[PDB]
Design a protein around this ligand. Structure first.
Ligand SMILES: OC[C@H]1O[C@H](OC[C@H]2O[C@H](O[C@H]3[C@H](O)[C@@H](O)[C@@H](O)O[C@@H]3CO)[C@H](O)[C@@H](O)[C@@H]2O)[C@H](O)[C@@H](O)[C@@H]1O
Ligand SMILES: OC[C@H]1O[C@H](OC[C@H]2O[C@H](O[C@H]3[C@H](O)[C@@H](O)[C@@H](O)O[C@@H]3CO)[C@H](O)[C@@H](O)[C@@H]2O)[C@H](O)[C@@H](O)[C@@H]1O
Lengths: 588, 588
């Protein structure tokens, strides 16, 4: 056994409470290096005859990535306290992995050797708003969704979809246009709407805010937003707003004051200024988003800034009842500010989904004291690499999916915001090089994946375009311009996701298929139901061997409803180029 | 190159801010598997300014434990934002280790493969009071230090130090006794005093609190305490009290109320009751410390309990100006409470040292938002196993120290409470088997180790005893039964520590010798300041060859003061059984 590959540390994704009485424990070892792993556990104060009392619970291998196998075990501590270790087996070899290193036999003269999960507290528990688990979000870039009020459009607005957007072009999209098309979303199956910035700002993206307490006049007014939200709730749709708290706009009043009065300004400490007076040439002498002069970084450590942003955060929730906050550039704002943000948001309305824009590993913001989730761009990346660009095998794709999933606690992955693209990425159809077949697979995987998926407006009808701003074309409403194959496909999948619980909250496991280069086989199971998905990611037709049991197994095709019994061990499914099929399993 | 052994993840001990402008980054690889490691780093938005090429910095190997090598690099991000990766050289082989995985060369495209440290916020920075780093604590179990007020001693107090202490015995130790012997501590060199519970409790240890707002009548009163703290302060001695917040005593009014009324009392939610009425056995029907019925666990989630406890925390600081809170059974209290705790305490007096009693890995409580340190018992284990029990070689000891040290951020280790024993462990002299020579080695290593070391009352004079309660004997004041050699050895070491910054704040490094089983060689570094320690852990004379650059190098025997240059290029030192020598290394 390779000790250098064995790992566990009593926190994060390796040790956590799943609920008020259950603890989850993981361990990772070198792939195929260990035959079995047993969790050694007991109450740290349970002694009898100078003998610490403990038991052995075999751990289940839940999956493996490129280098390791991940083992799982849940345990309900009798008195919510626990000391534990890991006994690894291989041939006649035996190893007791503990906090004090490895032993060859369970030491029991003391508990100090073992890892420790001191006490299970409801208060430290990770818990996200349960309703996001069954939600399928839809992202809207207001300036480009629908012009439902031509009079408020900024002069200079281009004719709808008359051309490709530019960093500064305008087409007149507004909040009214969203309301006018809600029926289109309801029909599609959407139950969540995520809006990019809608507060006063001079840009078409509005990430450079001028006033956080004002709806941009070009999108509408407060009454209009209130209607949109209530109109959404009427249809069972939740609404999430974008919080651009990392930086403000050049026209934010406090910043405009520091700009004119320099260091004497009462707002100078609301920012990160290196020298006075402030200047943008040759480069900003104050911290900013990226290196954008028009986007001054806010000082969230400043008591004033903190109170202002927190008011903003609570204002739109108490006055408009929004259901979520998407934290723009969340990772660049301090943790201290986020703990307060959460406390104040969750105290005002527990159901508010706190989503942070973090494109990378975000474990530190997902411990339960801060965000409920982050935009899963690592998911986006892996899925696109397999389905759109085909630059990795089914084998490597499975490894990457298992790797990112095991890097977080189970309850964290259940609330994850799984998107395929956004206003900051190129259009998926364009990443797929125009191949609708590939996009169908992307949507298939996303909608059969545990979490809270999000659809970028236009992706469901095949809109095209490279990265920002090309991905921000005006929403295509002309029926003859929308791709019906996709729309019905997406609608179908969302409806399936709603019917089968294993698709939105279950466990995913990949089954190795011969020619693990193009054939992707995986299943979702929540213990009650099992859905098997088979995907032929190749340009040729394929006869994919379904690795299942013979007599007793019955399958139901989810899309066609056809029911049939499994012959023997020879169940070969035939699929056309880039074809796929979903089956509900049954063992009698 | 063993990939399964390589590891990094942006948080805790691998990536953290050392100070407002400096980042520290660690990398772990298989011991002797990687020859060199280069840190690939840049600003996440360098592309905006057209800076796609990474900057490169070589990492330094800071140590190795049983299995891994640990690499280190400090970086001062130009704009406090950082994206990085690692380039590992195993000879001809070359791998780029990133969040996305390993590659043969840094990816040529613009995809997010790298680890990221979003932003360096001063507010998130881990920061313990700077003075603890120069403090040498002295732990006092009051009931057994000195009887300076005979009139308040418990009714049946046995004659001072006449017999062995028992779980229920009393000897009339008190605060006046400490006050009366402060001069002894001043001569010893002590600058900080840690007292066990002194609040009203029926027991001799007082961990089962009756009232948190009342000094125990047998220990003294308000003006006695005030005096002691003032007297200590006027001599540069900080005072740390024992906070027993996890559980209260049987006589705690709020609890007395529940055991009397039951599911009717207004204090039912102040505790962890599973059923009514309350039972004490076979086991209590309510949570408690271990399974002690007289120590019911408090519900720190309850707003009333929390308020009362936070009141206790601030109360003693404000009124008596104490300098530290030693948190009893800290790991069993929730993180939310510890956060509020830190806020209110640092708000009231930023200099207060918040030390939590946690015997195991405590990274979850030392991320900067909770404790300043924990009682470093793992350190105690390794040090006793090498110097006292001789159950491990100098090599294995060196590995364990590197192990527990590299598991935390450098700034966390610089404030670590390194003790050799306590009121919950056996006397070091007894663990050494009566060999005073071995005890000198323990003190030698302790007082040359970075952090805020603590000495258990009596160990400086060689008192004996097995584990609780044997270790809680009355302090020996008659010099005839003290062993003055040991006492001056410790006085000497406390003197040197105060004189050489490398001993209390420096970096430690273990050099490898021949008899890497009994010979221990290590140096403390901080700038050019350097102290070389050589230890002969054997029962007989030894000639230990210590390789050290000659030329402009001068050695200063810190014990005698003797100076002299290096000649043999690989100097040889002759030591008696269990001998040792400290040399200040001067580069001229
Ligand atoms: O580089 C010149 C560019 O500067 C401004 O725009 C900067 C970018 O602002 C927005 O980017 C936001 C993302 O959409 C959010 O998801 C998150 O990443 O936060 C960033 C910053 O707030 C906008 O979406 C981008 O298109 C912009 O490049 C000016 O407003 C632009 O006109 C200039 O071209
Ligand atoms: O059941 C035996 C024993 O139970 C009670 O005392 C239990 C222990 O309480 C104290 O232990 C504390 C340590 O000193 C602290 O450093 C930290 O670990 O927290 C624990 C619990 O608060 C006491 O110091 C020990 O001696 C005791 O074993 C009764 O009070 C005793 O009468 C019983 O003998």
């Amino acid at each position: 056994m390779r000790k250098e590959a064995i790992y566990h540390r009593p926190a994060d994704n390796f040790a956590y409470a799943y609920d008020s009485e259950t603890l989850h424990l993981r361990l990772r070892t070198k792939k195929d290096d260990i035959d079995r792993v047993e969790l050694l556990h007991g109450d740290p104060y349970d002694w009898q005859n100078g003998a610490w009392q403990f038991q052995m619970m075999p751990m289940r291998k839940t999956g493996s990535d490129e280098l390791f196998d991940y083992w799982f075990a849940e345990v309900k501590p009798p008195y919510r306290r626990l000391r534990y270790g890991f006994v690894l087996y291989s041939g006649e070899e035996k190893l007791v992995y503990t906090e004090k290193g490895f032993y060859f036999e369970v030491p029991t003269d003391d508990t100090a050797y073992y890892f420790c999960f001191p006490f299970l507290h409801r208060v430290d528990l990770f818990e996200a708003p349960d309703w996001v688990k069954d939600t399928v979000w839809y992202q809207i870039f207001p300036e480009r969704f629908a012009n439902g009020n031509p009079s408020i459009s900024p002069e200079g607005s281009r004719p709808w979809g008359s051309e490709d957007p530019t960093p500064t072009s305008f087409f007149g999209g507004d909040l009214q246009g969203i309301i006018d098309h809600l029926d289109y979303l309801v029909d599609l199956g959407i139950t969540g709407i995520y809006l990019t910035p809608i507060f006063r700002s001079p840009s078409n993206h509005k990430y450079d805010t001028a006033d956080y307490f004002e709806v941009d006049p070009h999108f509408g007014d407060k009454e209009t937003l209130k209607t949109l939200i209530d109109r959404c709730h009427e249809k069972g749709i939740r609404v999430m707003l974008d919080a651009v708290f990392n930086h403000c706009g050049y026209e934010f009043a406090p910043f405009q004051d520091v700009w004119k009065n320099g260091e004497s300004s009462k707002y100078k400490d609301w920012f990160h200024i290196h020298e006075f007076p402030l200047q943008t040439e040759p480069r900003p002498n104050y911290d900013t988003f990226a290196f954008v002069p028009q986007m001054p970084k806010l000082n969230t450590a400043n008591p004033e800034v903190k109170r202002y942003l927190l008011d903003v955060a609570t204002y739109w929730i108490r006055e408009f009842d929004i259901d979520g906050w998407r934290l723009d550039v969340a990772n660049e704002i301090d943790h201290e500010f986020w703990r307060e943000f959460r406390q104040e948001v969750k105290a005002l309305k527990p159901d508010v989904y706190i989503l942070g824009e973090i494109w990378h590993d975000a474990m530190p913001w997902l411990r339960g004291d801060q965000f409920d989730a982050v935009m899963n761009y690592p998911f986006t990346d892996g899925v696109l690499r397999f389905f759109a660009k085909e630059e990795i095998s089914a084998r490597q794709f499975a490894n990457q999916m298992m790797h990112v999933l095991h890097s977080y606690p189970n309850n964290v992955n259940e609330a994850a915001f799984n998107l395929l693209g956004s206003h900051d990425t190129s259009r998926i159809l364009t990443v797929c090089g125009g191949d609708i077949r590939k996009v169908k697979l992307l949507f298939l995987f996303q909608l059969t994946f545990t979490g809270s998926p999000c659809i970028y407006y236009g992706d469901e009808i095949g809109m095209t375009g490279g990265n920002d701003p090309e991905c921000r074309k005006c929403m295509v409403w002309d029926p003859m311009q929308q791709n019906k194959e996709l729309h019905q496909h997406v609608k179908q999948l969302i409806a399936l996701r709603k019917q089968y619980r294993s698709l939105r909250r279950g466990e995913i496991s990949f089954l190795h298929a011969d020619d693990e280069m193009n054939y992707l086989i995986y299943k979702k199971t929540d213990g009650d139901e099992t859905v098997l998905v088979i995907i032929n990611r190749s340009d040729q037709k394929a006869d994919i061997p379904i690795p299942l049991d013979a007599r007793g197994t019955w399958l139901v095709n989810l899309l066609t409803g056809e029911r049939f019994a499994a012959e023997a061990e020879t169940l070969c499914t035939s699929l056309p180029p880039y074809g796929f099929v979903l089956y509900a399993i049954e063992h009698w």
